[PDB]
Amino acid sequence: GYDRHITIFSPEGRLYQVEYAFKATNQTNINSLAVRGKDCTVVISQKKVPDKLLDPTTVSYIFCISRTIGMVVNGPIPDARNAALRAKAEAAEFRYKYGYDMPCDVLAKRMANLSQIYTQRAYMRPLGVILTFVSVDEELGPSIYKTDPAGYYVGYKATATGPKQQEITTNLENHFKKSKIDHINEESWEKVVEFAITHMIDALGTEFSKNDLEVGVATKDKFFTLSAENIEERLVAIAEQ
Amino acid sequence: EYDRGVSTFSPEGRLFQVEYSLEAIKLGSTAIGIATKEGVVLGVEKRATSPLLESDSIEKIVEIDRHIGCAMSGLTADARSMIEHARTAAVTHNLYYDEDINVESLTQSVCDLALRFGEGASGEERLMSRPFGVALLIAGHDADDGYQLFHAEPSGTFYRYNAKAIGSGSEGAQAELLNEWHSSLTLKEAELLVLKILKQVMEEKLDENNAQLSCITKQDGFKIYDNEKTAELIKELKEKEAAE
Amino acid sequence: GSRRYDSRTTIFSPEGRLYQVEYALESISHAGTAIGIMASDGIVLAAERKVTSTLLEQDTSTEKLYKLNDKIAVAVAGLTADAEILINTARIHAQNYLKTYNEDIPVEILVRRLSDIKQGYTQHGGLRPFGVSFIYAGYDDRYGYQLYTSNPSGNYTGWKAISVGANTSAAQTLLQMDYKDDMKVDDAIELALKTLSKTTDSSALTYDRLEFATIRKGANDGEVYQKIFKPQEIKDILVKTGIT
Amino acid sequence: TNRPNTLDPALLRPGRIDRKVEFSLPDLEGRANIFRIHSKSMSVERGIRWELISRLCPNSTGAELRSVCTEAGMFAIRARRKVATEKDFLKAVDKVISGYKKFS
Amino acid sequence: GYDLSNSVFSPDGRNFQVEYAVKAVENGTTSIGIKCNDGVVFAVEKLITSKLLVPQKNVKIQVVDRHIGCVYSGLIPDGRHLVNRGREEAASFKKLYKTPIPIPAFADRLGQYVQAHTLYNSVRPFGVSTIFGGVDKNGAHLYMLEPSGSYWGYKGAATGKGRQSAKAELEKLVDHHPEGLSAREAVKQAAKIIYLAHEDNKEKDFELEISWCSLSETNGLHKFVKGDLLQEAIDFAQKEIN
Amino acid sequence: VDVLDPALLRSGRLDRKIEFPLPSEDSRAQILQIHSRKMTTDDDINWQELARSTDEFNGAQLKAVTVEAGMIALRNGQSSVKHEDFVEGISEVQARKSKSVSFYA
Amino acid sequence: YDRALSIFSPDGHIFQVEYALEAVKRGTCAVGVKGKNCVVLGCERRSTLKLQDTRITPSKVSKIDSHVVLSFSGLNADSRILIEKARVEAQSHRLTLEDPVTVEYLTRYVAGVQQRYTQSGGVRPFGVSTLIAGFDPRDDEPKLYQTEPSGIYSSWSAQTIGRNSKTVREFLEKNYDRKEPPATVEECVKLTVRSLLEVVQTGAKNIEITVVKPDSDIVALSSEEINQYVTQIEQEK
Amino acid sequence: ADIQAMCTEAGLLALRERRMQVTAEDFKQAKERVMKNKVEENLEGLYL
Amino acid sequence: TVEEKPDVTYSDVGGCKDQIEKLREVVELPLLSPERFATLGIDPPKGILLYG
Amino acid sequence: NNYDGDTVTFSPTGRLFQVEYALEAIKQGSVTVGLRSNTHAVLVALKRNADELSSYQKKIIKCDEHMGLSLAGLAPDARVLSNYLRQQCNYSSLVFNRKLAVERAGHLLCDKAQKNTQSYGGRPYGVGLLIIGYDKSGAHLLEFQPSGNVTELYGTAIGARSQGAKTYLERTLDTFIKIDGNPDELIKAGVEAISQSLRDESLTVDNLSIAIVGKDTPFTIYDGEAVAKYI
């Protein structure tokens, strides 16, 4: 009856309403690749704009939730904004009541808990976005925590998201198999961008441009994004590798 | 289909639950109300269901105030809510302005109450899920328009009438009224008129243990005729129907 | 929206009968047997658990027997989960009575209060009622020992001997033949065990699956001692009465 | 046709059927009229209210009103009168309503 | 099923009620937004349904703050509710932070509001698209907000029945000027592509409305284009389509 | 087709997928005229006039007006169907035949 | 919560009110007959069942006021809620107006409890009908009223509700006259015993009789008293 | 119909016992047999 | 089963109903005056489906 | 039936059907025709009685001494809307020391309807108002649909047989706009306008109800023998 139309349990014990949320985040066809450097965390994501009449600069999916913590969104942009707004509010609040800015771990856990509550309520629809939170914390180092629409999250050595993310997994797996460590041993953050772009080309078979890329880098104690001019320096630097 | 909602339409174009309520007035026993400019008389069929019934403490005649009378027909559980509010309304006007309320003004106040169904509609405090199932014949006297008789719907709409009957015998009563009403009917000629029309729609014998009369006069106020006087008039009908 | 997924859970049937209450009585028949017998010196409460296992610790469990106050304990037959709410409501209510009158709550008052909650849930809110039946053993000065059964609708009925839960009919019929008013707590202990051996919910009745409790005025100076027997003290009485 | 949901679409096409009309369950005053024809044929009370019996009935077909008149006749014969009153028809309507409503 | 409400969902990613609501906007009036160098120039096709109507006395252009034009299509009451809400948001920003609301900030707030009604079945989704922009301290910007709760930057946008014609010529307008064009010249170009988007509405007759917020002309205030300037735009568009 | 499963609907099932909208304002007038062409046709009647007053009407709805205009004509005992009759015929297919007052007048 | 559990029907009814009245039909039979000097409410008890202590088992007649008694038919869960609200109201009248409540006042009050939940949504009406009877202060006029879950109330010379109310009522047409009630208290009491002995039968075990006499004199006639009355009627008949 | 059965079941019982007489007590046993599977406990499900 | 002009009028039918005036329009009107139909260029009706 | 019983839904065509149903209250309702010049506005409503004993129902409500509204649909709904306009008129007097502009009061009325169309358990208001008044920008004539949308015209109609009235007003359109300072002519033309809304309902002086508001005339409802100056 309503075991697939609201968030109540079925005879299977599996919530069909929740499953549908994960079947809408891959329909925007945005891939992400996120790697932990030795001093940084770099995340690159697709930014396919097929129109002359959309301004590509304002088409974005990397939202700065703290000054140190970036968030990259795979899935629909209404739900992205709502989850960004809520996350920013909480991160500010944490500074206010605990006297230091919210960790990546706990910010992930907080959105995770709200996602469960949104699938507890039968009239509230969960936010159907996969959120990757990249940072460099001083108590956790370079970190990636990835929350999902259900309310599950875990840490990561590296992670990918999108429909074609299995291909990305193959590259990352080889990289950390050979190195025998959970991060990239590269001490320049710029070259971790260069590496990330290389494996994106390998995985998807797609040759990238500066207007198909959007790059976020968390270094120690600051988060910035590269502009398309800076991303072009990296694309020229692939030829110099 | 079109009544599962708490306020819903209706491919006809007018609210559906309200429509049923209007066709539930017919279920109630006949209430007749004849207005002249010499006073307004209200007669009602009380209904006797058993001789074990005590029917002389049962009536469908209710005083709103001294200068306003009411006769109720339909489902009378609903009218209990409405009559209390009406009494309060009348009193409020004399509290606030030390003045007698108009018959029109009082009717309009009870109409405002009648629309309170729905549980998500408008800005007002909703306290019903369905409309009332009772129609009123508010009679009265104000000094600004003389004697007045209004018929108030469970819809929250009202018409001024010179004679209106509602209830079971609504159609057969009103058939007579269209021809037999005129303005040269005096209070007492109205009074015998009520009993003649009530006899046709009376499903028992016409007598005073299943009929109750009441007037509303400026001079004597709202007086409910005792069963002695009601009985007397009924016997005087049977004489004048043998004068034909 | 909200009205879409509601089916009007608590309403009458054409017979007049409340769907959820009818359903609730089925789920109490799933739950184990609980018997109460009122002696002329106490009340014996004896219940057979609806769960038993060799890995289940049943030696600290008191999953059916719970003390509401010092002179009133209950046995539970129904959903343990649902019962837990009423059990802590009862504790609050009994303590509230003690706070305000400095007198111990009579058995009648406490049972009536719980009953009102169960009625209330089907009356409004769309809430499911508590699907439990309790047997209250209680002492009070005025009526002495009082025995009561409550049903999930929210109504209480006095008894001298009664059974709820599984095998209510079978237990009742045996009680009718054996019960006498000259019975003591000693005799009532033996009767309860024998009745549970003929209404057993598997193929064996054991001490470890028996919860047992009395309220006896055999404590000195006319005082009442509630004793909830441990399963090895039950075992002692199991060899005494010759079940084993 | 009783139900026009039992008639073939070839038949329904134009020329075969150029008007479509639903017969309506007759109104209360309209039943006073259907009753009037049967009651004038029957030796009855003069000054009878037809409109009183039709008030008492809910929506009933004219065939029912024909049966009720026969039925009232029967109860009139039982008391040993051959001239009926409004009273025999009060009875007659009660019989039919309770009788038929339940089933067919 | 999965189409009864808006918090049913489907494995297809569709939400149904919201997609249905866009159909009202797609049968709404033609409305355009041109991103110019100095500002933005809005123009809206206003259908003339009868000769009984009073010309230029019914508007679909309501100003928000003193510097944000907002023009919308779809259900007019619903859009007037959305604009009513955003006049409060502008006032709130002005109260708290003592500045007229920036155009990117204004977009953020509206997107949240429209998000809320697709997350609950006890309220109904919106079915309007608004096109709003203006001149603030970070430059001129242009945004169109979908009833889904999605917005982007736009170098040109359109909505309504005649969106096909408008968009095709907005591509050519950005190919005329890839380095962008004046707000003043864009008056005459806004006229031209409303006239071409009235060839989707050529069973009907129309009144041309043009409004602007540009630094160069109106000094960062949103005003209406009227008088001789308006008539010049009409004459321009007339000769081009002839 | 929105009800129906989309597997059946694909290419080679069905190739072209062709929508039939309602008639528009101008289209209504053409469908009215041909219906009227069948009967006596006169300069009194203007099909465009009748097309603008009808709203959201397909040939099935438009046809009911035309026939119905010629029954008023029949009763009146006319030999030529006049414009007014068509105008009166519109309002019987509509939701009104009501001149009733209760609470929706 | 406000989602309708009472909603208007196309029959001009609410379904649950019709259902409510069938719930009272299945209930036990209460008879009310008033003399010229008493009210008598006798009711059917379900005390046939063995292993029952009737001291601690609820009665089917509960006094609300010193001179106002209330009997009930239908659900026993529902009835206690009406009995508690009625009592609280009675003491309020003493507080602010002085004097105990009139019988008529209580009749209207119970009716108004039923009324509220009939009209409002999120609530069902009760399935309980009452016979409210008694005296007013400084009055020797017996009062016999019936309230029903519709929200309507009616006074009666005699009345009966509960199972086989038609049968008892038919008996009362010949054994009670509107003109002449039972002259004495004792003939009123024996008439109510006589009416119960039709359907209820089965000794004085299930027969209860409560008599209220003018101005707060409530006596309950035990089974022993009833047994004597039964035997006399049986022998005479 | 069921009166007809009860009277016959009461002869059967008394024939079983080998006693010529038919008791009042006998008849109760026959009531028990006929009524047996008509039991209703949802009668005190509504009432209690 | 077949009959031959049986004597029944509208007096003997209880009430006048809308469905009777729709019968008058199919049956009487073209029989009495097929002239008016002809001049009009409306086809005369001869088909009726009766259901209820 | 899933979008025709609920007010909180769409509707595969982007509609709500409850609003279309509410527009059928206008069809079956009574008729009123409004026409204005620039100096006077006029509402001419056709009153309808139930029966001979019954009175005729006033279809024009005086909202202010410069404002009036007239119904053409659901009567209980008009009593909600009429009060709301008065409340806001007094708010304008209180706060801004100003008459409530007709243009402003249409937009307020619009959004008041909107938020009950949004909410579940709500309703669209099936009354159609024609709202005249005289403000500081002259005469105004607004048409209020069940949608809530307000539109400004020099002549409009709502109710049964509105089409005949609008044809009459489109012909005489440039006559009546250029007659100014003479309320009488505008009123006479409104009687003739609503004579095209008839279908053998006739016109009498107890069916004709006129109300005007001018530059120098307050809101006043003429009835009885004060409409016999035009019949």
Swiss-Prot record, chain A:
Entry-annotated residues carrying Phosphoserine: 227
PROSITE patterns found in the cross-reference section: PROTEASOME_ALPHA_1 (PS00388), PROTEASOME_ALPHA_2 (PS51475)
Name under which the protein is recorded: Proteasome subunit alpha type-1
Gene3D superfamilies in the cross-refs: Glutamine Phosphoribosylpyrophosphate, subunit 1, domain 1
GO BP terms, alphabetized: proteasomal ubiquitin-independent protein catabolic process; proteasome-mediated ubiquitin-dependent protein catabolic process
Subunit structure: The 26S proteasome consists of a 20S proteasome core and two 19S regulatory subunits. The 20S proteasome core is composed of 28 subunits that are arranged in four stacked rings, resulting in a barrel-shaped structure. The two end rings are each formed by seven alpha subunits, and the two central rings are each formed by seven beta subunits. The catalytic chamber with the active sites is on the inside of the barrel. Interacts with CIC1.
Example of a GO cellular component annotation carried by this entry: nucleus
Cytoplasm recorded as keyword: yes
Curated annotation (Swiss-Prot), chain B:
Sequence positions bearing Phosphoserine: 50
PTM-bearing positions, type Phosphothreonine: 49
GO biological process: proteasomal ubiquitin-independent protein catabolic process; proteasome-mediated ubiquitin-dependent protein catabolic process
One GO cellular component term noted in the UniProt record for this chain: proteasome core complex, alpha-subunit complex
Keywords (A to Z) from UniProt: Cytoplasm, Nucleus, Phosphoprotein, Proteasome
Pfam families in alphabetical order: Proteasome, Proteasome_A_N
Residues in the signal sequence: none
SMART domains linked: Proteasome_A_N
Subcellular location: Cytoplasm; Nucleus
Keyword Disulfide bond: no
Family: Belongs to the peptidase T1A family.
PANTHER family, per database record: PROTEASOME SUBUNIT ALPHA/BETA
Record note on quaternary structure: The 26S proteasome consists of a 20S proteasome core and two 19S regulatory subunits. The 20S proteasome core is composed of 28 subunits that are arranged in four stacked rings, resulting in a barrel-shaped structure. The two end rings are each formed by seven alpha subunits, and the two central rings are each formed by seven beta subunits. The catalytic chamber with the active sites is on the inside of the barrel.
Additional note from the record: Present with 17100 molecules/cell in log phase SD medium.
Name of the protein in its database record: Proteasome subunit alpha type-5
Native organism: Saccharomyces cerevisiae (strain ATCC 204508 / S288c)
Curated annotation (Swiss-Prot), chain H:
Family: Belongs to the AAA ATPase family.
Residue spans crossing the bilayer: none
Signal peptide: none
Domain of life according to the entry: Eukaryota
Source taxonomy: Eukaryota, Fungi, Dikarya, Ascomycota, Saccharomycotina
Protein name (record): 26S proteasome regulatory subunit 4 homolog
Residues represented out of the complete protein: 390 to 437 of 437
Subcellular location: Cytoplasm; Nucleus
Segments forming a coiled coil: none
Stated role: The 26S proteasome is involved in the ATP-dependent degradation of ubiquitinated proteins. The regulatory (or ATPase) complex confers ATP dependency and substrate specificity to the 26S complex. Has ATPase activity.
UniProtKB/Swiss-Prot annotation, chain J:
UniProt KW Ribonucleoprotein keyword: no
Primary localization: cytoplasm
Localization in the cell: Cytoplasm; Nucleus
Covalent link location (Glycyl lysine isopeptide (Lys-Gly) (interchain with G-Cter in ubiquitin)): 188
Keyword terms of this UniProt record: Cytoplasm, Isopeptide bond, Nucleus, Phosphoprotein, Proteasome, Ubl conjugation
Keyword Glycoprotein: no
Modified residues (Phosphoserine): 11
InterPro entries: Ntn_hydrolases_N, Proteasome_alpha, Proteasome_alpha-type, Proteasome_asu_N, Proteasome_sua/b
GO BP, sorted A to Z: proteasomal ubiquitin-independent protein catabolic process; proteasome-mediated ubiquitin-dependent protein catabolic process
One GO CC annotation: proteasome storage granule
Family: Belongs to the peptidase T1A family.
Oligomer status and interactors: The 26S proteasome consists of a 20S proteasome core and two 19S regulatory subunits. The 20S proteasome core is composed of 28 subunits that are arranged in four stacked rings, resulting in a barrel-shaped structure. The two end rings are each formed by seven alpha subunits, and the two central rings are each formed by seven beta subunits. The catalytic chamber with the active sites is on the inside of the barrel.
Other remarks in the entry: Present with 7210 molecules/cell in log phase SD medium.
Protein's name according to its UniProt entry: Proteasome subunit alpha type-6
Record organism: Saccharomyces cerevisiae (strain ATCC 204508 / S288c) (Baker's yeast)
